[PDB]
Design a protein around this nucleic acid. Structure first.
Lengths: 297, 101, 198, 172, 219, 11, 99
DNA sequence: TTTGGACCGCTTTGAGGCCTTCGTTGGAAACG
DNA sequence: CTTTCCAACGAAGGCCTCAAAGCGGTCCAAA
């Protein structure tokens, strides 16, 4: 098929050529001799044309291309925004789970391009390409869902899932043999930090400093609140507030943007910008496992 | 749709039946437990997971069937029972561990 | 004198602390709580130990822990974390010990007795369900499925072994089938495997 | 606790300086530039965030007061005028000085320099402009502060604090 | 030495807190270490300890290999008591060479034992005339007999057993010393199903309430 | 309860 | 619109599916409790009647001998199973206390 | 004087910023 | 009561830049 061929070509173009070999070592769809027939020192057009030749010599399909896309996503895992779904209310099996999920998504409207790829730490990665009742599913607007066996949490990349969100949720909860499924308001791009947060897996004596008690108290409070461990790499925060003025409630809306949050916030108190004890709205980001906040008096 | 709008429509109805069912049963058991409060008092401890009442408690009744002259064993154990020496031994032991508590 | 006596007392209490670590569980009291260390072992084989942080304040909270998430504790937390904390810790110790024993049996099988195995075993993170296939040498194929639905124990309650593609022809074959059934239902996995293979 | 220049007695050829501000790192670097070289008289450096100064029975004489102000933030200003209410007027007779940082970068100057100029002219106190970030400018300000300390401390015979105030006075 | 004494006291308080958290007090600990490389190291830890009512001694030699650990061997001594099943369970665990399950089982066994003894003392205190100490509060069975009529007696036997995996469970059974005179009197003959029925009653409403109702029926 | 026991032993 | 209808019907089905289970198990356990407590009331009343009848007859004739059958044999052997073990433990306790 | 080595040159190209397009409920407006 | 469009605007694909490194030319060390 030409569609799968151009899909594989686009995925390869997305892959940096410096690691394409690793991709093959992770893809393993093509024989190692075919890999040896291609040198990676030559031009990008030449290498992609040779890869097209190699995949056309074998039988190119959708499952192998989807697996390649999945493994590319694994190696990058930095180009999408992730949200977290919680299931609630004990026997598991991979094969029957896959069968049930596939059956539900086929029953969704008529068809959908679904691909599975088991990963270490029970990380089943699922690539889903949506399609309507009268069109083949599109491979240019995919979505990714990460499931952990026998766990109450799942991860989803929401690029176009706002079209049909309840369908994916009900399919996931029926496949997970769980009744209640909810979406917590927590959204971020560093997927590994989300993993850590959801599971909680994280001299010149002539100078006479004055107010040194204030400095030692503020540094101690900051250390006790944050800790010596490297804080999870979180990148976006937003609070929507509506509280009485006390100085008709004022409605406020703040967004914190930072390439490395929880560290500038860690340095605010030592820099003297904020008080020694920070407000609970900022000291419970890893504690409350909350990202979007609404508080009222 | 049909299958779905069939399969659920009965079960919820079943629910309703069971609902009133249990309600009636609840009322029943209520009055009935009041009856067992006529003489027994109203009132830590840890109950089992329905494992206490599973093994056979009277296996010994079978074991004694394997001993010879079971009736003669009863008779000789009775003629030993009336001996006051072992009664004195038992009461002496009782008195000995009475101060232990 | 006084320093020598203090040093002797310190080394005695340190030895007692080491002994406490070597049995049951461990706990190191800190400012914000106790980073309680739970120890795991099975059949005299030391296994990986975990730890969980505590908060001594009345709103009992777990701000940090190392126990894997697929072990259910939040329900057990609502059960006995607020009341009867001792039973809470004993139950979680039992559950972690059972999980560690199951994982040790599984990876011991994977590493050692893979010689007579004909395919990879499908295992859940909690290892409540096990499914695998094995060939024993006459040569007989089998496929076994074990249900460790009783989470507090390391022994399965229901095991089923069968084969597809071969019609029953030898009563002896069904005899080894039943023998293996009893072996899984009663005795540990690698133990019975080494028992019949040798 | 209102600070007084005439509370205790100083040490034998001893001089002391006080730096009050918000940026602790800048104060530490400035004190490092202060003590890069030591003159004949021994030098003591004190750093604080606000006034009144924390109580200490072992406090020596504080012969010089220097307030660092950043035009990058109004918070440093509010700090300066709140701290200014815990010192007697006698310090204002040449024992007080204002050092503005970042004035060169007019784009980064949050508050307008006219405000701090008016503030300094109101109290008739010396006003100095420097950039602590630049090592050369910081060093130059370092010998500047060391030598103004030498002048105000009375180490050199002939002038006093009011004399240097009449020297450093602005026309308007 | 004052700071060292304060630190030692704080550590002792922490150790006492952990001992309460485990219910076991280890009296002594002696450590020895040898290295036998072809890096195998053998460590021997002698320790005497005690649970609330029980005292025990045990030594074990363990092996560590450059990154696995396994106990080479162990010996362990109990004290002589009526509950000989404890000794055989100790032996079985000794072949199993398992420590954590052993200690949890011992604590559970003592926790059930303390419960049993306290309940026996409470019931004896409640009615001291219809309650007879056949062997003591720390025994396995109790017997209720009417002083006026010694023909009837009812014995409740309580025995704590250990599952092979290490699980612990109590068991309670009844038996009646009943003359056939009373059996001839009433033809209802419900004593045949008495054990199962009483077990169900206890499961429904506990042990202490069951015995209280039973002795109330004897008024 | 657990809190009262923990406080009674902590003292 | 049929796809939305799919959404609501599947949601209703998945919501109602668990609701059956807890009601079923509650009904079963309450029925078992009722049967058990009725049986237990019957047995306690019957044994109380046996006790009252035997007490009355014993007050009528206490001097008559009371024979027993094998049903009461094993527990009686329990008080015949005296091997000094309890008394030996008592002696050890006394020796510990004497210090 | 010839040959190899290392410098700087050049082109190639990988990644981030950013504009624009696609999708769009949600409300408004026309209506079988 | 229903349908379609404008709007609110969100979002992601695509354009565009440059900082990076490999290849190539040239000077200088060595034979």
């Amino acid at each position: 098929d030409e569609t799968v061929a151009e899909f594989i070509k686009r995925t390869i173009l997305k892959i940096p050529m410096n690691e394409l070999t690793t991709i093959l070592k992770a893809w393993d769809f093509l024989s190692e001799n075919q890999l040896q027939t291609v040198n990676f020192r030559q031009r990008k057009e030449s290498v992609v044309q040779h890869l097209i030749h190699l995949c056309e010599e074998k039988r190119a399909s959708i499952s192998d291309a989807a697996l390649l896309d999945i493994i590319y996503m694994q190696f990058h895992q930095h180009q999408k925004v992730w949200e977290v779904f919680q299931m609630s209310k004990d026997l598991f099996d991979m094969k029957q789970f896959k069968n049930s999920f596939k059956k539900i998504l086929q029953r969704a409207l008529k068809n959908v391009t679904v691909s599975f790829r088991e990963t270490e730490e029970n990380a089943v990665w699922i690539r889903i390409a949506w399609g309507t009742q009268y069109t083949k599913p599109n491979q240019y607007k995919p979505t990714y869902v990460v499931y952990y066996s026998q766990t109450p949490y799942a991860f989803t990349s929401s690029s176009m899932l706002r079209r049909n969100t309840p369908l994916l949720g009900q399919a996931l909860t029926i496949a997970s043999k769980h009744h209640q499924i909810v979406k917590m308001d927590l959204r971020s791009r560093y997927l590994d930090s989300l993993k850590a947060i959801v599971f909680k897996q994280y001299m010149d004596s002539r100078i006479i400093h004055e107010n040194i008690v204030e400095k030692e108290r503020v540094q101690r409070i900051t250390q006790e609140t944050f800790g010596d461990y490297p804080q999870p790499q979180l990148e976006f925060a937003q609070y929507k507030l509506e509280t009485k003025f006390k100085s008709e409630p004022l409605r406020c809306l703040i967004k914190f943007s930072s390439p490395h949050l929880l560290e500038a916030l860690k340095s605010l108190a030592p820099a003297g910008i904020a008080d020694a004890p920070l407000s609970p709205l900022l000291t419970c980001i890893p504690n409350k496992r909350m990202n979007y906040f609404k508080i009222r008096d | 749709i049909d299958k779905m709008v069939e399969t659920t429509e009965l079960m919820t109805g079943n629910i309703q039946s069971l609902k009133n069912k249990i309600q009636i049963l609840a009322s029943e058991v209520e009055e009935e437990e009041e009856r067992v409060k006529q003489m027994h008092q109203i009132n830590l401890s840890l109950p089992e997971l329905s494992q206490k009442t599973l093994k056979a408690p009277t296996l010994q009744k079978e074991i004694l069937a394997l001993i010879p002259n079971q009736n003669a064993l009863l008779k000789d154990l009775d003629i030993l029972h009336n001996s006051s020496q072992m009664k004195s031994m038992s009461t002496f032991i009782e008195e000995a561990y009475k101060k232990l508590d | 004198n006084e320093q020598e006596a203090l040093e002797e007392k310190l080394e005695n209490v340190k030895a007692i602390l080491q002994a406490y670590h070597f049995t049951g569980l461990s706990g190191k009291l800190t400012s914000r709580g106790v980073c309680v260390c739970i120890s795991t072992a099975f059949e005299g084989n030391l296994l990986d130990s975990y730890f969980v942080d505590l908060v001594i304040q009345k709103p009992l909270r777990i701000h940090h822990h190392s126990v894997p998430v697929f072990i259910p504790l939040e329900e057990i937390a609502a059960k006995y974390l607020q009341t009867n904390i001792q039973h809470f810790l004993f139950s979680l110790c039992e559950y972690l010990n059972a999980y560690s024993g199951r994982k040790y049996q599984a990876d011991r099988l994977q590493s050692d007795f893979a010689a007579l195995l004909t395919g990879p075993l499908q295992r859940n993170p909690l290892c409540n369900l096990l499914s695998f296939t094995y060939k024993l040498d006459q040569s007989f194929p089998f496929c076994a499925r074990l249900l460790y639905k009783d989470l507090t124990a390391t022994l399965p309650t229901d095991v089923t072994v069968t084969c597809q593609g071969v019609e029953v022809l030898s009563t002896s074959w069904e005899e080894q089938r039943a023998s293996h059934e009893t072996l899984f239902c009663t005795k540990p996995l690698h133990q019975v495997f080494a028992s019949f293979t040798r | 606790s209102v600070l007084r220049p005439l509370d205790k007695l100083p040490g034998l050829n001893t001089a002391t300086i006080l730096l009050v501000g918000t940026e602790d790192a800048l104060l530490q670097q400035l004190a490092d530039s202060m003590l890069k070289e030591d003159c004949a008289s021994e030098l003591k450096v004190h750093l604080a965030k606000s006034l009144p100064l924390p109580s200490s029975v072992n406090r020596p004489r504080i012969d010089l007061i220097v307030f660092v102000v950043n035009l990058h933030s109004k918070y440093s200003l509010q700090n300066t005028e709140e701290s200014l209410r815990h010192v007697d007027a006698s310090f204002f007779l040449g024992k007080v000085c204002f050092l503005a940082t970042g004035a060169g970068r007019e784009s980064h100057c949050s508050i307008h320099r006219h405000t701090v100029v008016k503030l300094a002219h109101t109290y008739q106190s010396p006003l100095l402009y420097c950039d602590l970030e630049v090592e050369g400018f910081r060093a130059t300000m370092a010998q500047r502060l060391v030598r103004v300390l030498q002048i105000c401390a009375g180490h050199v015979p002939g002038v006093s604090a009011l004399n240097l105030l009449s020297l450093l006075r602005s026309s308007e | 030495s004052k700071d060292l004494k304060n630190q030692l006291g704080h550590l002792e308080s922490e150790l006492s807190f952990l001992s309460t958290l485990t219910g076991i007090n280890i009296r002594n600990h002696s450590k020895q270490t040898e290295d036998l490389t072809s890096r195998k190291v053998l460590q021997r830890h002698r320790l005497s300890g005690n649970c609330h009512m029980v005292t025990f001694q045990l030594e074990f030699q363990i092996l560590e290999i450059q990154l696995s650990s396994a106990v080479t061997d162990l010996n362990i001594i109990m004290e002589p008591t009526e509950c000989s099943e404890l000794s055989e369970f100790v032996s079985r665990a000794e072949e199993r060479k398992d420590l954590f399950m052993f200690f949890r089982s011992l604590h559970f066994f003592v926790e059930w034992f303390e419960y049993r003894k306290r309940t026996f003392k409470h019931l004896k205190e409640k009615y001291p005339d219809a309650v007879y100490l056949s062997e003591g509060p720390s025994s396995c069975s109790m017997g209720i007999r009417s002083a006026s009529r010694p023909g009837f007696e009812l014995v409740i036997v309580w025995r704590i057993q250990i599952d092979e995996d290490g699980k612990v469970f109590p068991k309670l059974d009844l038996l009646t010393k009943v003359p056939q005179r009373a059996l001839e009197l009433d033809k209802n003959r419900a004593i045949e199903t008495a054990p199962l029925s009483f077990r169900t009653l206890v499961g429904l409403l506990g042990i202490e309430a069951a015995l209280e109702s039973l002795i109330k029926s004897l008024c | 309860d657990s809190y009262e026991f923990l406080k009674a032993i902590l003292n | 619109k049929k796809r939305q209808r799919m959404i609501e019907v599947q949601d209703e089905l998945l919501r109602l599916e668990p609701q059956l289970k807890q009601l079923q198990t509650k009904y079963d356990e309450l029925k078992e409790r009722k049967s058990s407590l009725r049986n237990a009331a019957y047995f306690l009343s019957n044994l109380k009647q046996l006790y009252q009848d035997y007490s009355d007859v014993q007050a009528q004739e206490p001097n008559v001998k009371e024979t027993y059958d094998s049903s009461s044999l094993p527990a009686l052997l329990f008080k015949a199973r005296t091997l000094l073990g309890a008394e030996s433990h008592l002696r050890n306790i006394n020796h510990q206390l004497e210090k």
